[PDB]
RNA sequence: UAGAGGUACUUAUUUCCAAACUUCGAACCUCCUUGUUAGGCAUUUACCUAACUGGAAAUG
RNA sequence: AGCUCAGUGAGGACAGAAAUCUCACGUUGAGGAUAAGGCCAAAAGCUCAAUUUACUGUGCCUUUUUGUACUAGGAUCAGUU
RNA sequence: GAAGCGGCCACACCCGGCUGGCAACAUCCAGCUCCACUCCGAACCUGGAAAUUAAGCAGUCGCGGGCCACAUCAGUACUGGGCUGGGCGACUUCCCGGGAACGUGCGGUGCUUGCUU
């Protein structure tokens, strides 16, 4: 029947990958060259804009590495965008750009440098801008990707991200794809844009809403200053507690009870 | 609903036998049938017996997905009257079968191209075989979603009204 | 032919096996290490009878085949290929060497070609066994007396307490069998660890 | 013809007659080190005395 | 056939322990060094750019230069008669912060804790110092388990 | 080395081994530290940092 | 930048111990110009694409100082691609 | 409790069962532009949201394989000093010091850094 791969000799020999390599979330060859700084700069922070896109949410952060672990300085998240205007389509391309503006303008209002670095930057006797690097992650770096949508939001927000590079931006290409289903197929418009009809925003409105989204983000960027954080964290456990409790651990006494009742069927008790 | 078996794909390949303009003709046999421009297989070894070099075009092959793969099996199994052997099925519940006498599937006007025989092979899977394929959060599927051999035979009788 | 084995008794180098590096090696005199009723049991042949070596030295392959043939032919004569089981618990892996000599270039490029296989013993290494029934324990001791004159140095013949070739005393064997912890392989005893 | 190749019998004896600890003059070694660091370390000293 | 190569007689030096193959964690690159710091050189076998020599494995030194990826380390090899100094350059992935001084620095701060707090109450100070392990005071011992060890009669057990 | 269990191989075993085998691993060795250590203050820099009433280094 | 190899297991017209195709397991045993030993898995392997840093100039370090060199390698500075 | 970001990198891995989805993660649905398949919207990419916890994920169970921990194993193996000790020799008592491994027995099977609803 051929060789059994996976003996004791296999599993004893087997080195594991780290953890977030196993869970398959970080490339550690990226990360080790994202973090590194020259030893002549010593203990100096350099910031990195994380911008990972799940389904529904576009997440965007600014991170400093430390030996204990990474530390977010400021965060923004596309489920906040209902407050500023954008009710639906929270992983659009224009939704990804809108989070880019939030991460910029919140970070600069925390550091108290809002009057400086208003527009994009594009050189002496002038204050140098924030170096913030892009962490993409395992998402593939192709042109017109939603990772670089978050980048363009951060650059137009304020921050000097280095790169080499207004359609797709105020709701175009969404708005054209509405018209192709609306005009021809009609059945498919009900499938594809169910929620949109429900509001209903319509094809034309996408251009209008985003501009006033970019107005309101630039005016009132920071939000939800909650304290203390401990009593906030306690309320979330009660608020989001499964109705059905998770199975809990059997103690060492009641395990040996159940072991023996199985062993009574096949004989030779009791022990372990 | 998400324990439904479906056809994931139907991978054709055609090896004519022997080298030359039989291979580029066998591409046109695939291209008109499948509606897809065919990938050309290269060899890995010189074997003088069968008439093969190390680096040369042996075969053509192509990978069909969606409604198109389900359509061809309906015409292809109608050659054998919806009948194949029980020992066709592999341990994952994937099966295949031969169609010599090309044109059966397959209707066409031969002139420049010859007739060339067919290696069809089907891949039955559940919904969530995304997770093995993907990059971000790659992992293994469960024991439950893995298709057994004996469940795959029950699908074949249910789907095509077939017999073994 | 051969050297006298007083040449190659004591151990004056590191061990030197048949490998990639040794190359030009003749195969040993031993092929069979084990004779008699090989397919038997722990329970069928409980009584055991060992030959222990009382020296740290080399044992030749030629000695070990002389000891097998003298053992078999006595046990064949008495009881007649039924009860007994003979085993040899040395395997010759160490390769000897010669400078040859046989005008001449002696002591220059002294390293020499391999001559024969050998086994490196250790003080109280058993170099033979006979497993048998209580009827022919008498015959087993008289066999290993004759086999001891084949070997270099001096060497004690001992009736073991433990069953078969298993590491279990007769007192322990009944307790484990009764407990049901131990089990029987085709030959020898396989323990049950309850895991 | 064939005499001895080497020995270390009484290497130890000779070494211990005197293993003197050779002390370093200063920890900086300005032939090495970064020039960009030492360049600035000059302009620290030059600016101070004025 | 004795050879004087660079990486010679290092079969087991530059081996990678066991289940510690691969590149190191990116926490290692985030660490920092200074001039004057005591550091021990032990090698990553994987990372081949900017190794030390075989000889300065397991060898303490002091940092004198620091440079974008690498640290100039001063280490005292024993030559023939005399202990020479050796100016190494070596990368940070073969270099760790040594805990030679951490016994000494613990005591100095523990002494200042004692020397101040004696004056705070004040009162009057007893002077602590290190001392080798010393012979014991007299004292009295009641046990209530006393075995009686004897040599048994010898039996072979084979 | 020599049997048993599976469909010559193979799953567990067993007799007995390696200077150019290692999943463990001593003894004997080897190297570093053990008096000044914690700070605070403000000058210098064309260097570092987004920024200086910071960092880095040397002068007090 | 993307992908994973050697191999084993089952399958698949002609198809055979070996042609091309498919799924599954696969800690690296393959491969990395060659000796032998290390080292390596979203790579240092294989594939595709664009390229010339296989570049210019002075000190410094290690092998090696009980003997300083050349060879080879290493960390920089000053350029430029 | 869930999610992005991580630290030590199997007490976390690997096989197989069972119990959960308010939001969240995900499967999933569709293919027009950005761009993607040396063929294929499978992947990658973009735009969704109908119905599900079947899978991933989370928690948990197994006289599970492995991994980790303690105790035995054992004052055994080996070993640093010392003898006008023994022994034809090979090797080895003893005196002053240090001291394993495999195996077996019992236990365990991830602990939380900073931000968010």
């Amino acid at each position: 029947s051929a060789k059994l791969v996976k003996n004791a000799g296999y599993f004893s020999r087997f080195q594991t990958k780290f953890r977030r390599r196993r869970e398959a979330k970080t490339d550690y060859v990226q990360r080790t060259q994202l973090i590194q700084q020259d030893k002549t700069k010593y203990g100096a922070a350099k910031y990195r804009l994380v911008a990972r896109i799940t389904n529904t949410k576009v997440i965007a952060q600014i991170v400093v590495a430390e030996l204990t672990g990474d530390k977010t300085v400021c965060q923004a998240l596309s489920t906040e965008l209902p407050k500023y205007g954008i009710k639906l389509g929270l992983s659009n391309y224009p939704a990804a750009y809108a989070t880019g503006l939030l991460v910029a303008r919140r970070f600069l209002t925390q550091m108290k440098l809002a009057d400086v670095f208003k527009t994009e930057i594009t050189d002496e006797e002038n204050r140098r801008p924030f170096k913030v690097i892009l962490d993409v992650g395992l998402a593939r770096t192709t042109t017109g990707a939603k990772v670089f949508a978050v980048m363009k939001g951060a650059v137009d927000g304020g921050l000097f991200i280095p790169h080499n590079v207004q359609y797709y931006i105020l709701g175009g290409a969404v708005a054209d794809y509405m018209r192709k289903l609306k005009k021809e197929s009609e059945e498919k418009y009900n499938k594809q844009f169910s929620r949109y009809v429900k509001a209903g925003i319509t094809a034309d409105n996408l251009e209008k809403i985003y501009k006033d989204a970019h107005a309101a983000i630039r005016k009132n960027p920071a939000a939800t200053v909650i304290a203390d954080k401990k009593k906030h964290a306690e309320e979330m456990k009660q608020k989001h507690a499964p109705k059905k409790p998770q199975t809990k651990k059997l103690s060492f006494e009641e395990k040996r009870k159940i072991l023996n009742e199985h062993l009574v069927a096949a004989g030779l008790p009791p022990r372990k | 609903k998400l324990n439904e078996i479906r056809v994931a794909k139907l991978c054709i390949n055609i090896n004519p036998g022997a080298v030359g303009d039989q291979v580029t003709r066998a591409s046109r046999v695939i291209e008109q049938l499948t509606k897809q421009q065919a990938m050309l297989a290269r060899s890995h070894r010189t074997i003088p017996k069968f008439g093969i070099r190390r680096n040369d075009k042996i075969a053509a092959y192509a990978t069909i997905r969606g409604p198109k793969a389900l359509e061809i099996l309906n015409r292809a199994l109608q050659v054998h009257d919806y009948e194949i052997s029980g020992r066709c099925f592999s341990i994952e519940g994937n099966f295949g079968f031969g169609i010599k006498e090309h044109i059966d599937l397959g209707l066409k006007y031969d002139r420049d191209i010859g007739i060339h025989g067919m290696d069809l092979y089907v891949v039955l899977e559940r919904p969530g075989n995304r997770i093995s394929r993907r990059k971000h959060c790659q992992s293994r599927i469960g024991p439950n979603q893995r298709v057994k051999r004996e469940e795959a035979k029950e699908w074949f009788v249910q789907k095509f009204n077939g017999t073994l | 032919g051969r050297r006298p084995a007083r040449c190659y008794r004591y151990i004056g180098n590191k061990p030197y096996p048949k490998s990639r590096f040794c190359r030009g090696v003749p195969d040993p005199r031993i092929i069979r290490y084990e004779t008699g009723t090989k397919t038997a049991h722990a329970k069928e042949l409980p009584i055991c009878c060992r030959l222990i070596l009382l020296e740290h030295e080399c044992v030749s392959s030629e000695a070990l085949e002389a000891a097998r043939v003298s053992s078999n032919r006595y046990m064949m004569k008495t009881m007649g290929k039924d009860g007994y089981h003979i085993k040899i618990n040395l395997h010759p892996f160490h390769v000897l060497r010669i400078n040859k000599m046989l005008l001449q270039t002696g002591m220059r490029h002294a390293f020499g070609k391999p001559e024969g296989l050998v086994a490196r013993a250790n003080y109280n290494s058993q170099i033979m066994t006979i497993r048998t029934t209580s009827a022919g324990l008498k015959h087993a001791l008289e066999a290993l007396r004759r086999a001891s004159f084949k070997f270099p140095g001096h060497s004690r013949v001992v009736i073991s307490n433990k069953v078969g070739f298993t590491p279990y005393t007769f007192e322990q064997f009944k307790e484990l069998q009764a407990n049901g912890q131990i089990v029987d392989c085709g030959n020898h005893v396989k323990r049950v660890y309850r895991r | 013809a064939k005499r001895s190749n080497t020995s270390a019998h009484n290497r130890s004896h000779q070494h211990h007659r005197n293993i003197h600890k050779c002390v370093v003059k200063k920890l900086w070694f300005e032939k090495g080190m970064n020039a960009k660091f030492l360049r600035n370390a000059r302009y620290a000293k030059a600016g101070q005395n004025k | 056939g004795h050879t004087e190569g660079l990486r010679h007689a290092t079969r087991y030096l530059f081996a990678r322990k066991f289940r510690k193959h691969g590149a190191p964690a990116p926490s290692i690159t985030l660490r920092t060094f200074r001039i004057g710091d005591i550091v021990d050189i032990k090698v990553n076998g994987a990372l081949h750019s900017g190794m030390p020599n075989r000889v300065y494995h397991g060898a303490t030194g002091i940092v004198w230069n620091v440079s974008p990826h690498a640290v100039g380390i001063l280490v005292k090899r024993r030559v023939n008669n005399h202990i020479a100094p050796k100016r190494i350059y070596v990368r940070t992935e073969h270099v760790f912060p040594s805990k030679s001084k951490n016994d000494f620095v613990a005591r100095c701060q523990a002494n200042l804790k004692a020397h101040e707090e004696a004056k705070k109450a004040g009162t009057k100070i007893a002077l602590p110092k290190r001392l080798p392990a010393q012979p014991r005071a007299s004292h009295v011992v009641k046990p209530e388990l006393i075995q009686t060890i004897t040599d048994a009669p010898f039996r072979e057990n084979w």
Side-chain angles (χ1 to χ4, degrees), chain A residues 16 20 29 39 45 51 66 80-81 94 102 141 159 192-193 199 210 216 225 232-233 247 269:
Chain A
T16 52
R20 300 182 63 74
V29 181
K39 305 303 189 211
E66 298 197 318
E80 298 174 307
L81 300 170
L102 272 171
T141 54
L159 305 171
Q192 190 68 246
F193 299 110
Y210 294 75
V225 180
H232 191 55
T247 77

Coordinates of all heavy atoms in Angstrom, one line a residue, chain A residues 16 20 29 39 45 51 66 80-81 94 102 141 159 192-193 199 210 216 225 232-233 247 269:
Chain A
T16 N 7.4 24.2 12.2 CA 6.3 25.0 11.8 C 6.7 26.3 11.2 O 7.8 26.8 11.5 CB 5.4 25.3 13.0 OG1 6.1 25.8 14.1 CG2 4.6 24.0 13.5
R20 N 1.2 33.8 11.6 CA 0.6 34.7 10.6 C 1.0 34.3 9.2 O 0.4 34.8 8.2 CB 0.8 36.1 10.9 CG 0.2 36.6 12.3 CD 0.4 38.0 12.6 NE -0.3 38.9 11.7 CZ -1.7 39.1 11.7 NH1 -2.5 38.5 12.6 NH2 -2.2 39.9 10.8
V29 N 8.9 38.6 4.6 CA 10.0 39.2 3.8 C 9.7 40.6 3.4 O 10.6 41.4 3.4 CB 10.2 38.3 2.5 CG1 11.4 38.9 1.6 CG2 10.6 36.9 2.8
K39 N 20.9 52.0 11.5 CA 21.4 52.0 12.9 C 22.0 53.3 13.3 O 22.0 53.6 14.5 CB 22.4 50.8 13.2 CG 21.9 49.4 12.8 CD 20.6 49.0 13.5 CE 20.3 47.6 13.3 NZ 18.8 47.3 13.3
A45 N 11.2 56.2 15.1 CA 10.0 55.6 14.5 C 10.0 56.0 13.0 O 10.5 57.1 12.6 CB 8.8 56.2 15.1
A51 N -3.3 49.3 4.8 CA -4.6 49.5 4.0 C -5.1 48.2 3.4 O -5.1 47.9 2.2 CB -4.3 50.5 2.9
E66 N 7.2 48.2 17.3 CA 8.0 48.1 18.5 C 8.2 46.7 18.9 O 7.6 45.8 18.3 CB 7.3 48.9 19.7 CG 7.1 50.4 19.4 CD 6.8 51.2 20.7 OE1 6.0 50.7 21.5 OE2 7.4 52.3 20.9
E80 N -17.6 54.2 9.1 CA -17.7 55.6 9.6 C -18.4 56.6 8.6 O -18.9 57.6 8.9 CB -16.4 56.2 10.1 CG -15.8 55.5 11.2 CD -14.4 56.0 11.6 OE1 -13.5 56.0 10.7 OE2 -14.1 56.3 12.8
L81 N -18.3 56.2 7.3 CA -18.6 57.1 6.2 C -20.1 57.5 6.0 O -20.4 58.5 5.3 CB -18.1 56.6 4.9 CG -16.6 56.4 4.7 CD1 -16.2 55.6 3.5 CD2 -15.9 57.7 4.8
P94 N -14.3 54.7 -4.7 CA -14.5 56.0 -4.0 C -14.6 55.9 -2.5 O -14.3 56.9 -1.8 CB -15.8 56.6 -4.6 CG -16.5 55.5 -5.3 CD -15.3 54.6 -5.8
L102 N -9.7 60.4 5.6 CA -9.9 60.3 7.1 C -8.6 59.9 7.8 O -8.3 60.5 8.9 CB -10.9 59.2 7.4 CG -12.4 59.7 7.5 CD1 -13.3 58.5 7.6 CD2 -12.6 60.7 8.6
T141 N -0.3 44.1 -6.4 CA 0.0 45.5 -6.7 C -0.2 45.7 -8.2 O 0.8 45.7 -9.0 CB 1.4 46.0 -6.3 OG1 2.4 45.1 -6.8 CG2 1.5 46.1 -4.8
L159 N -0.3 63.7 3.5 CA 0.9 63.0 3.9 C 1.8 62.7 2.7 O 1.3 62.2 1.6 CB 0.5 61.7 4.6 CG -0.4 61.7 5.8 CD1 -0.8 60.3 6.2 CD2 0.3 62.5 6.9
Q192 N -28.0 43.5 -9.1 CA -26.7 44.1 -8.9 C -26.8 45.3 -7.9 O -25.8 45.5 -7.1 CB -26.2 44.6 -10.2 CG -24.7 45.0 -10.2 CD -23.8 43.9 -9.9 OE1 -23.1 43.8 -8.9 NE2 -23.7 42.9 -10.9
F193 N -27.8 46.1 -8.0 CA -27.9 47.3 -7.2 C -29.3 47.4 -6.4 O -30.1 48.3 -6.7 CB -27.8 48.5 -8.1 CG -26.4 48.6 -8.8 CD1 -26.3 48.4 -10.2 CD2 -25.3 48.9 -8.1 CE1 -25.1 48.4 -10.8 CE2 -24.0 48.9 -8.7 CZ -23.9 48.7 -10.1
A199 N -32.5 53.1 -1.4 CA -32.3 54.4 -0.7 C -33.3 55.5 -1.2 O -34.0 56.1 -0.4 CB -30.9 54.8 -0.8
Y210 N -20.1 62.2 -3.4 CA -18.7 62.1 -3.1 C -18.0 63.5 -2.8 O -17.2 63.6 -2.0 CB -18.0 61.2 -4.0 CG -18.4 59.8 -3.9 CD1 -19.6 59.3 -4.4 CD2 -17.6 58.8 -3.3 CE1 -20.0 58.0 -4.3 CE2 -18.0 57.5 -3.1 CZ -19.2 57.1 -3.7 OH -19.6 55.8 -3.6
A216 N -17.0 67.4 3.9 CA -17.3 67.1 5.3 C -16.1 66.4 6.1 O -16.0 66.6 7.3 CB -18.6 66.3 5.4
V225 N -14.7 60.6 20.4 CA -13.7 60.7 21.6 C -14.4 60.1 22.8 O -15.0 60.9 23.6 CB -13.2 62.1 21.8 CG1 -12.2 62.2 22.9 CG2 -12.6 62.7 20.5
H232 N -15.7 51.1 28.1 CA -16.1 50.9 26.7 C -15.9 49.4 26.3 O -16.8 48.8 25.8 CB -15.4 51.8 25.8 CG -15.9 51.8 24.4 ND1 -17.2 52.1 24.1 CD2 -15.3 51.6 23.2 CE1 -17.4 52.0 22.8 NE2 -16.2 51.7 22.2
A233 N -14.8 48.9 26.7 CA -14.4 47.5 26.4 C -15.3 46.4 27.1 O -15.5 45.3 26.6 CB -13.0 47.2 26.6
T247 N -19.2 26.0 24.1 CA -19.0 24.8 25.0 C -17.8 25.1 25.9 O -16.8 25.7 25.4 CB -18.7 23.5 24.2 OG1 -17.4 23.5 23.8 CG2 -19.7 23.4 23.1
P269 N -10.7 -1.7 32.7 CA -10.7 -0.4 33.4 C -9.5 -0.3 34.5 O -8.7 -1.2 34.5 CB -12.0 -0.5 34.2 CG -12.2 -1.9 34.5 CD -11.5 -2.7 33.4

